[PDB]
Each structure stands twice: as C-alpha cells, then as structure tokens.
Amino acid sequence: SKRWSDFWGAPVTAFLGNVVSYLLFLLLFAHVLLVDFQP
C-alpha cells in the first residue's frame, strides 16, 4: 500500500486525472448537444 500512494500522489497524475475528466466532460456535452436533445 506504498506504491499506490506513490503513483497517485504525484502532481503529474493529478494533472492527468484533470485532463482525462475534462475531455470526457466535453464529449458528454457534445453527445447531449448534437445527437439526443429532446424538445
């Protein structure tokens, strides 16, 4: 239970989690806006 907090504690993985979650936000926003937008 040491290398778990070693990998996930570094700032590159907090940044990488930020970018991956933010691109999935834009993909969700695009799927809502383009494909299924019921009136």
């Binding site: 933010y22 936000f25 834009l26 926003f29 695009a30 806006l33 937008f37 009136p39």
Partner: protein
C-alpha cells in the same frame, strides 16, 4: 483575489452562460434560444484547454 484574475473570470463566464442556457431552455417558448446559447457556451468551455 478571485475577481482579479482572468481565468477565474473566464470559468465564471462559462458557468453563467450555462445557467442562462438552462433557464432559457426550461421555459416552453424559448427552446431555440437555449439551443443556441449552449452552443456558444461549448466554445467557452473548449477555450479552457488553452
């Protein structure tokens, strides 16, 4: 200290246009207005990545 910067202001701007897009969508006669405000809002969320 929040208001002084420009990307705290810009992310504030993307969320205020989001609230305006929802509140214009939920009224029954203003559907196409919210349909266009969310499109301009998607531009402001994607200029976040810079």
């Amino acid at each position: 200290l929040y208001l002084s910067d420009t990307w705290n202001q810009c992310d504030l701007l993307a969320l205020t246009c989001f609230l305006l897009g929802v509140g214009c969508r939920l009224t029954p006669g203003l559907f196409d207005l919210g349909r266009t405000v969310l499109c301009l809002d998607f531009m402001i969320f994607t200029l976040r990545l810079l």
